[PDB]
C-alpha cells in the first residue's frame, strides 16, 4: 500500500 503511494509523489528514483 505504502510503496504504491511512495512511487507516486516524487520520492523514488531509478538507477540503470
Amino acid at each position: 500500500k505504502k510503496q504504491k503511494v511512495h512511487a507516486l509523489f516524487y520520492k523514488l528514483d531509478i538507477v540503470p
Epitope: 516524487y10 523514488l12 531509478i14
Partner: antibody, heavy 116, light 113 residues
C-alpha cells in the same frame, strides 16, 4: 538501459478497434506508475490516465474516462492503451511515460492516423 | 471546481546568450495535504518526445543543465533559463504534478528579432 519502447505507427480506419503498447526495460516495471499522454497534430499535451502495473490500479483523467482502456501485462513489462471503436478525431501522437518518480523516462511516441 | 492551468506568454522571443522566463498559474493553490507542492515543467523540441526539466516546483531532473531553474509557490510558478542556448528553442509546458495531471497550454519559444 532504462527505456520505454512503444509499438509502431498505426494507419487505421474509423470503426476499428486498436490497442497500442509501451514496453519498459531496465528497471522493475511493476513498481513505477505509467501514464499515457495524447498530442493532437499541432496541439498541446494532454494527460489521459495512469496505471500501477503491479496491481493494475488505474486512474483516468476526467476528460478521458470511458473513452479508452488503460491496462498492463506485467509479465512482459508492457502497458497498453485501447480504443473499442476509433474515430477520425483520435488521430494524434500518443506517448507513454513513467509518472511520479524522481526519474523521468518517455516513450518515442506512437503516431495514430485514423481516416476513411 | 476543476483547476485551470495557464501560462504567459503563449509565445516567448528569446536571444541566445541572454536570460529568459516563462510563467505558469493555477486557479487554486497546488499545495498538497502532505505539505509539498507538486508542479512540473517539461520541454519538447520539434519532432521529439517531451522531457521533464523540473519537478516539485524547483527540483531539477538528472542531466538537465543548471541554467534551468524553477520557482514559485501556491498559484504562481516560473521557469527561468539563465543563458539561452540554441538547443533550448522548444515548447515548454507546466503541469499539475498530481492527478488529474492538468497540463498548461504550452509556451512556444522562438528567436527574437
Amino acid at each position: 538501459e532504462v527505456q520505454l519502447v512503444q509499438s509502431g505507427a498505426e494507419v487505421k480506419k474509423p470503426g476499428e478497434s486498436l490497442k497500442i503498447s509501451c514496453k519498459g526495460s531496465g528497471y522493475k516495471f511493476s513498481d513505477y506508475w505509467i501514464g499515457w499522454v495524447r498530442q493532437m497534430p499541432g496541439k498541446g499535451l494532454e494527460s489521459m490516465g495512469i496505471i500501477y502495473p503491479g496491481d493494475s490500479d488505474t486512474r483516468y483523467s476526467p476528460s478521458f474516462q470511458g473513452q479508452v482502456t488503460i491496462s498492463a501485462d506485467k509479465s512482459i513489462n508492457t502497458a497498453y492503451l485501447q480504443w473499442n471503436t476509433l474515430k477520425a478525431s483520435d488521430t494524434a501522437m500518443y506517448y507513454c511515460a513513467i509518472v511520479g518518480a524522481k526519474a523521468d523516462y518517455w516513450g518515442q511516441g506512437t503516431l495514430v492516423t485514423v481516416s476513411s | 471546481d476543476d483547476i485551470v492551468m495557464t501560462q504567459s506568454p503563449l509565445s516567448l522571443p528569446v536571444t541566445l546568450g541572454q536570460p529568459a522566463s516563462i510563467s505558469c498559474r493555477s486557479s487554486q493553490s497546488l499545495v498538497h495535504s502532505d505539505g509539498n507542492t507538486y508542479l512540473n515543467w517539461y520541454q519538447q523540441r520539434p519532432g521529439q518526445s517531451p522531457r521533464r526539466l523540473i519537478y516539485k516546483v524547483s527540483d531539477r531532473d538528472s542531466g538537465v543543465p543548471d541554467r534551468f531553474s524553477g520557482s514559485g509557490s501556491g498559484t504562481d510558478f516560473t521557469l527561468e533559463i539563465s543563458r539561452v542556448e540554441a538547443e533550448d528553442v522548444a515548447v515548454y509546458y507546466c503541469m499539475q504534478g498530481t492527478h488529474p495531471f492538468t497540463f498548461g497550454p504550452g509556451t512556444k519559444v522562438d528567436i527574437n528579432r
